[PDB]
C-alpha cells in the first residue's frame, strides 16, 4: 500500500519510466513562416 520515498526513486526515476512522471518532450510547434506558406489545402489531385 505504501513505499519509502527513497524506494520510489529506485522504481520510477529510470530512463524508460520518466515520461509518466514529469514533462519530457515539449514539442515546439510549426514555425509561423511555414504555416503562412501552405495554401490552406494540403491535398489536391487532378486540379494540380
Amino acid at each position: 500500500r505504501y513505499l519509502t520515498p527513497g524506494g520510489l526513486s529506485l522504481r520510477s526515476m529510470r530512463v524508460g519510466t520518466l515520461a509518466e512522471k514529469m514533462t519530457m518532450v515539449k514539442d515546439e510547434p510549426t514555425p509561423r513562416f511555414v504555416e503562412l506558406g501552405t495554401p490552406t489545402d494540403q491535398m489536391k489531385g487532378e486540379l494540380e
Binding site: 520515498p5 520510489l8 526515476m13 514529469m22 515539449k26
Partner: protein, 161 residues
C-alpha cells in the same frame, strides 16, 4: 511533539529540580498569550477549505503549472496539490497552538526534500504557495495573531528549502 509547557517541564525535569520561579514566569508568558491562540485556531478551522481556495488562486492558478506541461495538470495531481497543501495549514495551527515548532520538525519536515524530489514536485512553487497562503491567513486572523502564525509558516518554508 512538545509545546511551551512541555519544553519548560522537560528542561526543568532534567536538571532534577522542581518547577521554580524562573520557569513559572516562562509558563505565564505562554499563559498570557494562550487566549490569543485559541481565537486564532478557531477561525482557521472554520475556513480550512477556503484559505487553500484563495491561495491557489493567488500564485498557482493560470500559470505554467496549471497548464499541461506543468505539474498540477491532471485532475489526479491537482487534488493532491490541495491535499499536500492542506497539511501545511493543519500542522501550522498545531504549532501555533503549541507555541513551539517541534511538531513541524517531526511530522511535516521529514521527507520534504526527498518526497517532493522523487515525485516531480517543484520546491519553488510550494514556497511561493505558502507565503501566498500566509498573506491570506494573516489577513484573516489579524495583525497580532498573524505574526505568531507567521513564525510557523516561515519555519516550514525555511526548512523546506
Amino acid at each position: 511533539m512538545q509545546d511551551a509547557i512541555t519544553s519548560v517541564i522537560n528542561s526543568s525535569d532534567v536538571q532534577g529540580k522542581y518547577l521554580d520561579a524562573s520557569a513559572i514566569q516562562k509558563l505565564k508568558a505562554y499563559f498570557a498569550t494562550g487566549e490569543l491562540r485559541v481565537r486564532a485556531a478557531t477561525t482557521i478551522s472554520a475556513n480550512a477549505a477556503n484559505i487553500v481556495k484563495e491561495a491557489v488562486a493567488k500564485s498557482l492558478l493560470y500559470s505554467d503549472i496549471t497548464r499541461p506541461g506543468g505539474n498540477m495538470y491532471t485532475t489526479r495531481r491537482y487534488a493532491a496539490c490541495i491535499r499536500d497543501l492542506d497539511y501545511y495549514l493543519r500542522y501550522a495551527t498545531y504549532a501555533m497552538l503549541a507555541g513551539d515548532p517541534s511538531i513541524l520538525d517531526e511530522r511535516v519536515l521529514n521527507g520534504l526534500k526527498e518526497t517532493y524530489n522523487s515525485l516531480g514536485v517543484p520546491i519553488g512553487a510550494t514556497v511561493q504557495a505558502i507565503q501566498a497562503m500566509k498573506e491570506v491567513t494573516a489577513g484573516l486572523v489579524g495583525a497580532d495573531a498573524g505574526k505568531e502564525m507567521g513564525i510557523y509558516f516561515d519555519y516550514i518554508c525555511s526548512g523546506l528549502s
